[PDB]
């Protein structure tokens, strides 16, 4: 089988701008093992039939895992705009994989405030699909070459989510795993009954 008890239950989910890409191959990929996740979790996918993904198979399964708040889990989809889908993690419009997201208020929220999860806020452009940026160069919009220090229009691009248990469903930490299947000229070796 694929290891799905090594992606969905990892103790270390990275922040969104540094999403961890994990290649899974040589399997019998059973997606009926995901019943014992969180009581409500969004299993929506595109380009494959969700009643037939256990019989159609692929050369590789790329799983990307990150943590975002609930207000912006909508942007984890092709053809979406926002902070995440433009500046942090963009899905291509030719997407052939599945987007899985569940609430993680138990694991990722401290009463003092969980500051370990950061998102990119200003980056002077957009992101091409499946491209990350771990760059921490100081953002430049004003007409000052003062990059060593903060200024009027010079900001540090990464900002913190500040997860707390006193916040709405839009601000609760939603751990996201996006499987990204690909079909190529190689033999598949992922499918099985």
């Amino acid at each position, epitope marked *: 089988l694929c290891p799905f008890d*090594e992606v969905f239950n*990892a*103790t*270390r989910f990275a922040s969104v701008y540094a999403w961890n890409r*994990k290649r*899974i191959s040589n399997c019998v990929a059973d997606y009926s093992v995901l019943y014992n996740l969180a009581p409500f979790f969004t299993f929506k996918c595109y380009g494959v039939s969700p009643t037939k993904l256990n019989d159609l198979c692929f050369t590789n399964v790329y799983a990307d895992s990150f943590v975002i708040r609930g207000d912006e889990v909508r942007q984890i989809a092709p053809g979406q705009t926002g902070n995440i889908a433009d500046y942090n993690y963009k899905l291509p419009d030719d997407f052939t994989g599945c987007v899985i997201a569940w609430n993680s208020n*138990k694991l990722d929220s401290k*009463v003092s405030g*969980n500051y*370990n999860y950061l998102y990119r806020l200003f980056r002077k452009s957009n992101l091409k699909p499946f491209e990350r940026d771990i760059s921490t160069e100081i953002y430049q919009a004003g007409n000052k070459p003062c990059n060593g220090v903060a200024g009027f229009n010079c900001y540090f691009p990464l900002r913190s989510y500040s997860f707390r248990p006193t916040y709405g469903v839009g601000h609760q930490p939603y751990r996201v795993v996006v499987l990204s299947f690909e079909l190529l000229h190689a033999p598949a070796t992922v499918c099985g009954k």
Partner: antibody
Amino acid sequence: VQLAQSGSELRKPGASVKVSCDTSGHSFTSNAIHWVRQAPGQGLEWMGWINTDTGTPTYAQGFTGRFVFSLDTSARTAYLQISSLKADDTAVFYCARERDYSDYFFDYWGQGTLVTVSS
Amino acid sequence: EVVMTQSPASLSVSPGERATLSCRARASLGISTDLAWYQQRPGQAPRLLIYGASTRATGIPARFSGSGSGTEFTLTISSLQSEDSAVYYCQQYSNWPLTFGGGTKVEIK
């Protein structure tokens, strides 16, 4: 790096036992206080963790249904309560607590308490 | 879970020579430097030695160097004293059934 715990119990089969872990001796920044079972001659087994300041337990595979974790009125000391003690259950239950948040290694351990279920 | 097989079963290394501990995982994608090494002296609670694969906890002597990554890790004990005759466990804090190791009972000749 020591946490206070309860003493030993020479309990009987088919009974209930309570195990305390008073971690109110330090200043903290985490919110989890884990439980570890050790057999009298075998290795450590991770039982699960009770979540401080929200009271929600989470158990491992073999330690569900009978073992229950709970907190006391204060938000410091955590309780372990074994229900329906069996014959092969004599063990040294440890109380391990992390140092920092999202650091799932156990820097601060308990002193270990021993149930002695027999007749 | 990740069943963490620890080898060997018992080590008998004379002082102050080198003892090599090995803790091999069963992860298809690897622990990826998320192991923790404990040391349980008999009649005593375990003590956290190394958090992560390499860096040590506070108060630890410099002789307890840890190394390795992925699915094969190593604890090396240099100048193995009489105080180190203890059972050594390894814990993966990678997947949520945080499985401890078997335990290599180090013995002094």
